Amino acid sequence: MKLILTAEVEHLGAAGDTVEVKDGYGRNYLLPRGLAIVASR
């Protein structure tokens, strides 16, 4: 799902990078540990 990055994640991008991710990845790794949040405004 669409989201931007909060911290540095390897093979994805830098902070603030808008990357396209699979729902499993974003729901189970990035969002729960706060490495990213969804794109609203």
């Binding site: 729901r27 969002l31 729960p32």
Partner: protein
């Protein structure tokens, strides 16, 4: 198994039709998954039953 703890989605009932058109009763169950949700950012995890549509809608907070 057949009832979602979130939206109340339940099994439907219908018939199973063979080539000879013999109709037999069968059920249509929802795609109910056991998901450890995080109700509050404190971190308490509880095992709940959610349909895959509820997971899709972000309604179950599996944080």
């Amino acid at each position: 198994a057949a009832v979602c703890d979130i939206c109340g989605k339940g099994p439907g009932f219908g018939k199973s039709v063979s080539h000879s058109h013999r109709r037999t009763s069968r059920r249509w169950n929802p795609n109910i998954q056991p998901v450890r949700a995080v109700t509050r950012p404190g971190g308490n995890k509880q095992r709940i039953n959610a349909c895959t549509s509820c997971i899709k809608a972000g309604k179950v907070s599996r944080a």
